[PDB]
């Protein structure tokens, strides 16, 4: 992370060992589950690219997922090296502008990452861009390791409607389908895959029942 | 959060990553359960509106609940923009007074939030007002996702009276009913929905038995 | 319909009784089924609005569907009376420009409909605009009377994969859902709702199998 | 279609609505079955490319099959734009020669299609070339939707030999296999997949029995 010091300059404070150990624990227990994507973001907040590399280096043993996060990073960096091209011959005595690889931290020092992150002129938020690239990689890992598909989720005959709602929305988090497909699933598939009685109360509510109206109506049905 | 520095001025210290990661964990495990409302308050204590937005941004994937917390915030801000109207033409060189949107932090910088929070003259506690608005939103989410209704809760034939009391009061926390309805439930419904024997001992106690007297009397009955 | 005669002018030839009787038969046998929408278009080709009214008048007894086709026509005419407003004071000795009601034929003679349909200057195709409005009305009737929902369709244990494909696509024709939802259903729901064996061969094909590849692979499976 | 008028010139008479409605019915009932290919040819006889487009536009809802007929048309037009290249700079006051797209009618007026179809010099039969391209597309649709494969067809123990012959030849119509494979199937597979008794009478006939000899011999066997 970065702390400001007297003179208006900034320095690097290494991520706490227990901040790194929390990340490890999460990846070892949730197995790249939907929750890992937000868990990574909260534990990587205010981090330079250098620190994000260490967090990944602490969870490298999960090689399959790391290979997926690594192929997504290279592509989001290539797109940065195509749409943010070298401006031209950089003047001497000046830091080069960041390339996709600098945003990652692989070809750049943490100080360079800090100089960009806090440029008085055109600050480049290299830490947040790289966290966004890794979140695309982790979300692809959440989908690949997702244990139950949205379609398979079906309310148990006795299962309370809210727990069936809880499992239905958790699988939808993994789904990478178009947002309209997500809206049609929450409005059509969720009434389609409910136990016989809850299905009669939901159809009873009428057309386009909101989730609050559906949860309120099926509370204690079954 | 806010730390005071030499000169009598205040600065902003970003919420710790592990303070943010605790919030995520809670929302991912308690599923907007009654406990989330107090858990949010303890982890948002001494926060500017800016920080409260980040905590919410770390739990955005729970879109249904976030939509409910977001509709409650807009209404508590509209009521602030009606009962705390722009005083009139603000003098130049002065910070504008906060509007419902400034209390949220959406249309305002953290420094402005800090200047109000610590105004030498008429300090506006924007952080606490916004936490109160979100607590109304989370409490509506606790009620919507509540799995068991107060009425359905019924003591098991062998269930110890205290565990039946524990489940009865946990559902009452979710209930948004008038306080008198809450007092009549704790004094009438709790004796009505007890296993046959405990019901005879409670009626034996007499009229208006206190909870302590009821727990003491039914200890070891069944 | 319209025939051209010597002098460069056009006249009206009444729709054949057996062209009208075919329409009746279809509506009496397919019961506003998906097939009725194309059947109407083929039997209403080259028709003035006047003729389209008679076809509808021959199937008026189906009052519920006619009320739906009539509410859709009034709205598509109101939108025409808002986006194609009276240009201004029409000069004397000239036919007024068509309004939503003229496109229908209700407030206009067939000759006026023909004069517009074949205007040397800015011909307005009133017959085709009204056929399009009625097709929106019939398609809403196809959806309302659709007997099986896309989701319910599930391949029989012995049913050949192609017949299950035939029923799956016929229900999709009735579906008015967004096109992406239609693409996700044909690529995901169609493999999800197949009998156990065909489901194993389809997953065997790999990711994004085309319909031809799926029909070829499951031919004779079961 | 095209009618000749006084002066030696030709004009276009729009395909009858009931000629178009027959086509619709067939495609809606035979589901792109082998019979659709001949049914299309008889109902498209003496048609300009313009009319053939309308027939297809009346059966567009069958999107999967239409996509197959559309990919076959583009390829048969590309082959026409490669083997029948623009002759060179066309003289002014003259109709351009037809390209694959003109044969389809997509980039050409019906009058141009008629001028070519009835050129006094080098008439190009654009209507028949496009019908041939669509027949390749429909035949691919017959094969894709074919419900029973030639190999699977096996005479029922009681099924009369002629009905088994009827099903065997109907599946062979769908088969796109080399003609020799078609001759070997009709001479070997048809005796191989007959019920035990008919198989003994057919082997009894001797080597290379004609279909007439086989039908005559197995009449009333079983
Ligand atoms: O809530 P606490 O009583 O303070 O316990 C905390 C809590 O762990 P648990 O709540 O799951 O028991 C911390 O996690 P937070 O909820 O505060 O975010 C965790 O710190 P981590 O972020 O690293 O997980 C820390 O565990 P540890 O000390 O192993 O780092 C642990 O403190 P104690 O276990 O010492 O009570
Ligand atoms: O194919 P055909 O031998 O000419 O029979 C036709 C055919 O009806 P069917 O094919 O269903 O038996 C006509 O329909 P098309 O397929 O030609 O479009 C139909 O005319 P409609 O369009 O009005 O249905 C007409 O029936 P009808 O004479 O009652 O009008 C009928 O002719 P026949 O029944 O006299 O043989």
Residue numbers in the entry:
A (entry chain A), B (entry chain A), C (entry chain A), D (entry chain A): 1 to 222
Give the original sentences from the paper that presented this experimental model:
The icosahedral pentamer was nearly identical to the pentamer from the CLPs with a model root-mean-square deviation (RMSD) of ~0.7 Å. Consistent with the high resolution, excellent density is observed, and we can confidently build an atomic model of the CA molecule in the assembly. Instead, the HIV-2 CA structures exhibit several additional polar contacts between adjacent chains, particularly between NTD helices 2 and 3, which could explain how they modulate forming pentamers and hexamers. This subtle rearrangement suggests that the 58CVGD61 loop of HIV-2 functions more gradually than the switch mechanism proposed for HIV-1.64,65 In accordance with this model, we observe icosahedral pentamer-only particles without kinetically trapping a molecular switch in a particular state by mutation. We observed density for IP6 in the central pores of both HIV-2 CA hexamers and pentamers, with clear density for R18 side chains.
During HIV-1 or HIV-2 infection, the capsid is a necessary component that protects the viral genome and recruits host factors while trafficking to the nucleus. The capsid is comprised of approximately ~1,600 copies of CA molecules, which oligomerize into ~250 hexamers and 12 pentamers (capsomeres) to form the distinct fullerene cone. In this study, we leveraged the approach of templating the HIV CA lattice assembly on liposomes, together with stabilization by the small-molecule host factor inositol hexakisphosphate (IP6),75–79 to produce regular HIV-2 CA lattices. We report the first high-resolution structures of HIV-2 CA capsomeres in their native mature lattice using single-particle cryo-EM.
